[PDB]
Amino acid sequence: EYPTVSEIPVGEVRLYQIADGVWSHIATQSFDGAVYPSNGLIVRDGDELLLIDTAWGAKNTAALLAEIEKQIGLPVTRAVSTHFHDDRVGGVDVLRAAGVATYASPSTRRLAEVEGNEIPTHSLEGLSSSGDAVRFGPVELFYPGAAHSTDNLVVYVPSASVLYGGCAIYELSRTSAGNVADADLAEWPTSIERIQQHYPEAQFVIPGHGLPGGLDLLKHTTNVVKAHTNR
Numbered sequence: 002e003y004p005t006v007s008e009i010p011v012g013e014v015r016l017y018q019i020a021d022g023v024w025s026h027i028a029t030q031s032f033d034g035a036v037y038p039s040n041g042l043i044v045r046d047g048d049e050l051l052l053i054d055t056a057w058g059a060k061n062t063a064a065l066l067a068e069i070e071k072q073i074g075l076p077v078t079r080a081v082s083t084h085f086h087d088d089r090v091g092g093v094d095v096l097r098a099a100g101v102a103t104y105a106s107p108s109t110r111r112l113a114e115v116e117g118n119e120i121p122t123h124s125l126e127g128l129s130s131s132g133d134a135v136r137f138g139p140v141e142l143f144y145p146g147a148a149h150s151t152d153n154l155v156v157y158v159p160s161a162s163v164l165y166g167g168c169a170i171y172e173l174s175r176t177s178a179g180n181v182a183d184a185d186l187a188e189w190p191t192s193i194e195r196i197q198q199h200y201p202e203a204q205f206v207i208p209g210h211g212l213p214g215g216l217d218l219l220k221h222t223t224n225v226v227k228a229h230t231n232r
């Protein structure tokens with residue numbers, strides 16, 4: 002079964018095989034007085050691994066690398082951060098020290114710098130406008146437009162029909178919105194529909210936090226977002 006927040010002590014990381022060559026990584030961290038789980042992705046990239054997102058902090062990201070080496074044993078050579086918050090770039094300095102080449106969009110790099118967060122080294126070109134998509138090894142990066150944040154990316158693994166939504170997509174169980182400080186509530190439903198439009202064949206959908214689902218997570222998130230702007 003997918004690991005839940007109460008089963009992962011802060012500082013530990015779990016791996017979860019989603020499909021051949023595709024794992025999520027799961028960690029936990031404190032935020033405003035509570036502990037929350039957080040997902041990222043790992044995708045076989047030939048003889049190497051591509052990492053999507055840190056494990057939310059330096060200590061968790063070190064545990065991520067150790068668990069990867071223990072369970073998969075291929076080198077993590079590149080990482081992409083899907084937006085500028087700490088659950089996506091916190092730990093970039095650990096990855097860099099470990100030899101990983103770190104990447105994000107120019108928007109993400111700039112917003113991390115304004116925020117005082119860790120800044121991935123390399124800029125991802127070709128993602129500046131809503132609906133842009135670029136191929137990055139075994140995945141497609143896609144900018145659906147502003148949502149949870151103005152810079153948030155999603156990631157699709159074509160060989161497996163896995164859609165990693167990051168923080169723009171909520172888990173089913175979640176019925177309220179919290180941490181919409183940086184969000185574009187008015188644009189968010191339309192960005193979700195841009196994802197639905199571009200990835201209608203997605204078999205697995207991973208939210209930034211919580212249990213995986215299918216495309217039903219998309220409409221569910223819209224409802225939760227719309228519920229917030231009607232009150």
Ligand SMILES: C=CCCc1sc(N)nc1C(=O)O
Pocket residue numbers: 032037038039086087088149168178179180209210
């Ligand atoms: C997880 C849910 C509580 C709010 C937080 S904390 C964090 N690092 N991200 C979020 C989010 O909404 O994406």
Ligand SMILES: [Zn+2]
Pocket residue numbers: 084086149150168
């Ligand atoms: Zn965020």
Ligand SMILES: [Zn+2]
Pocket residue numbers: 086088168209210
């Ligand atoms: Zn988040």
